[PDB]
Amino acid sequence: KAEYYNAWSEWERNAPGEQRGMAVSRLRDALDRQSHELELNNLGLSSLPLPNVTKLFLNGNKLTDIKPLANLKNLGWLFLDENKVKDLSSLKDLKKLKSLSLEHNGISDINGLVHLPQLESLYLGNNKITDITVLSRLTKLDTLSLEDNQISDIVPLAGLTKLQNLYLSKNHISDLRALAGLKNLDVLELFSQEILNKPINHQSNLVVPNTVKDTDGSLTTPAIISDDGDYEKPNVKWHLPEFTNEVSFIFRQLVNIGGSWAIFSGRVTQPLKE
């Protein structure tokens, strides 16, 4: 009991020249009243110093180390938006966790999340994620937000049949074939994809195969083509008598998956050399 207040005061005294005093006050109130909710939102905390706490609010801080949360096995809801958390293996034993929010954290390695197969909602919007392989194990998710990342391979999502809300806008998605089986979807977002092809040699008669495919595998007909190019399936064609550094084309197609209807929109950019 006394060791808890001692550790909290020692943590507060180590604040750099951050509202650690308010954090200590809230910790004392939660420990005294045996509260199940701990709200430490927007305290600028750069570090961290309760068996009944089930919801932990930590949005709006500067946390990089989440080791002090490793033994909070009663946690059901954990919010860590706008932090700087990069390692997630510290949550491997939070087997009661149902909801997890890690938006605006700049995270690229989400492999540790393979240790939370019971998760029901997962928010990873606005990060640096490319590989979502381990997400294939989270077969109990009904909400998954992956918007504003660098994801190009969404095949790991093909078996997550329980999904009802899926946010995939602002990524590098060009192939929706992996989503064809998610017939339980209610909300789906797929707009503003940015696809970058490998650089190819410039030609006066430039021919670029279209690679944008819908959920049926059919090529998406481009909506706009730069440099007066045209489309004759499967090829986008340009006449470039003078060299230019890049061409591009923008696509926009309505897609229906389950009970969800979404605009699959984006832009493919083709760099040219020589």
Residue numbers in the entry: 8 to 24, 28 to 59, 64 to 288
Describing publication, verbatim:
Epitope I (residues 412 to 423) is a prime example of such a structural flexibility, as epitope peptides comprising this segment have been crystallized in complex with nAb fragments in three distinct conformations. This suggests that the conformation of this amino acid segment follows an “induced-fit” binding mode to the antibody, and this conformational flexibility could explain the limited immunogenicity to the epitope I observed in patients with HCV. Binding kinetics of E2_EpiI scaffolds E2_S2_1 and E2_S3_3 against Fabs AP33 and HCV1 using sE2 as control are shown. Superposition of AP33 and HCV1 Fab complexes onto the designed E2_S3_3T1 structure revealed steric hindrance of Fab AP33 but not Fab HCV1 with juxtaposed loops. The steric clashes are caused by a variation in the angle of approach of the two Fabs to the epitope, which differs by 22° between HCV1 and AP33 (51). Together with the low thermostability profile of E2_S3 variants, a scaffold size that might hinder the assembly of multivalent NPs for immunization and the apparent limited antibody binding of E2_S3 variants, these results identified E1_S1 and E2_S2_1 as the most promising immunogen candidates.
Several viral immune evasion mechanisms have hampered the development of an effective vaccine against HCV, among them the remarkable conformational flexibility within neutralization epitopes in the HCV antigens. Here, we report the design of epitope-focused immunogens displaying two distinct HCV cross-neutralization epitopes. To address these limitations, we generated epitope-focused immunogens based on two antigenic regions including one on HCV E1 (residues 314 to 324) and one on HCV E2 (epitope I). Here, we have demonstrated that small thermally stable protein scaffolds that accurately mimic the structure and specific conformation of two HCV neutralization epitopes in complex with a human bnAb can induce nAbs in the context of a murine and a human antibody repertoire.
